[PDB]
Amino acid sequence: MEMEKEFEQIDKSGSWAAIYQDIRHEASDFPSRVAKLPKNKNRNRYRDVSPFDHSRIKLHQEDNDYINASLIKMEEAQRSYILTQGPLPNTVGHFWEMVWEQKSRGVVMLNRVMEKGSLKCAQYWPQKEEKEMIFEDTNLKLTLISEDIKSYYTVRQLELENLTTQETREILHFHYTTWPDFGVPESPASFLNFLFKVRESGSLSPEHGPVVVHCSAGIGRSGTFCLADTCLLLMDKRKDPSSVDIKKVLLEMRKFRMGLIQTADQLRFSYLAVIEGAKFIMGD
Numbered sequence: 001m002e003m004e005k006e007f008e009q010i011d012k013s014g015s016w017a018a019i020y021q022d023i024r025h026e027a028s029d030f031p032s033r034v035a036k037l038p039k040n041k042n043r044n045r046y047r048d049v050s051p052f053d054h055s056r057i058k059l060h061q062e063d064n065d066y067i068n069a070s071l072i073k074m075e076e077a078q079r080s081y082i083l084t085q086g087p088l089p090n091t092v093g094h095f096w097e098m099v100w101e102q103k104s105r106g107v108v109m110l111n112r113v114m115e116k117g118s119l120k121c122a123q124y125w126p127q128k129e130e131k132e133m134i135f136e137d138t139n140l141k142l143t144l145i146s147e148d149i150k151s152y153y154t155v156r157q158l159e160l161e162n163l164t165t166q167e168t169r170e171i172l173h174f175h176y177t178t179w180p181d182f183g184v185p186e187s188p189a190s191f192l193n194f195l196f197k198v199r200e201s202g203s204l205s206p207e208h209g210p211v212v213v214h215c216s217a218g219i220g221r222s223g224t225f226c227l228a229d230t231c232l233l234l235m236d237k238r239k240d241p242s243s244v245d246i247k248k249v250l251l252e253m254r255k256f257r258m259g260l261i262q263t264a265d266q267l268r269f270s271y272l273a274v275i276e277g278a279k280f281i282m283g284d
């Protein structure tokens with residue numbers, strides 16, 4: 001079925017939970033043996049969210065190459081994404097090592113450091129220009145260059161230096177700051193505006209390594225971001241945009257990381273975002 005009228009048909013019939021459970025039942029199951037090794041326990045935030053072995057990002061290190069991060073490669077859309085958990089106190093150096101080694105231009109953050117009165121990820125970037133961060137375990141230096149605070153999101157320019165080689169690179173930090181502590185946003189307008197700002201920066205384009213996108217677990221809000229982006233790109237590429245099937249795209253992405261889209265409300269929100277976004281691109 002088309003999307004916008006499949007949407008109204010699920011609303012009127014109140015069957016979002018059943019649609020979402022079908023996706024959970026059909027989703028891929030692949031091994032994650034490296035994630036579960038005892039030496040990696042303090043490298044995982046949640047015991048039930050792990051990268052698959054076949055798609056995990058490897059650190060360029062011989063001691064321990066493990067990080068909780070997955071490469072999502074979308075062949076028809078010609079886009080790739082790295083989805084990862086929010087960094088832990090003992091993985092902030094690994095996080096920036098991955099950004100460096102994978103040649104990423106942008107980092108997309110969809111959570112606040114504290115939500116619901118608890119810590120959802122480490123403070124992993126510097127908050128003042130004159131107070132830079134040094135990660136001694138991976139030999140990197142990170143400096144805040146500029147910060148632009150807007151009503152729904154903040155963009156930061158960062159400098160990452162590989163202290164072994166003295167090479168430097170400019171990284172863009174795109175921080176969506178207004179996702180509610182509970183539920184999903186009422187309108188997708190600010191989330192779509194944010195997606196378009198990431199696109200306009202070059203951070204999603206083939207002349208760079210994959211964008212790094214995270215929330216707390218790296219599957220829920222993060223899944224919504226890449227699902228919406230890929231569906232909108234496919235609608236632009238194809239002769240028949242109504243042939244894009246958001247459930248099929250989501251199942252394809254779940255071949256590369258488990259659990260993408262965590263609730264039926266997130267699924268409904270993803271439909272809403274793609275529907276509204278397709279009108280602004282031109283459509284209607």
Ligand SMILES: CS(=O)(=O)N1C[C@H](O)[C@H]2C[C@@H]1CC[C@H]2O
Pocket residue numbers: 010011013014015016017018264265268
């Ligand atoms: C009732 S439902 O399955 O269709 N469903 C939608 C409803 O709006 C509420 C509660 C439930 C699941 C998500 C949430 O959106």
Ligand SMILES: CS(=O)(=O)N1C[C@H](O)[C@H]2C[C@@H]1CC[C@H]2O
Pocket residue numbers: 075076077234243244245246248249252
């Ligand atoms: C058919 S589609 O547009 O919904 N779609 C094609 C796209 O390339 C992805 C995901 C999905 C089906 C498998 C794969 O080819």
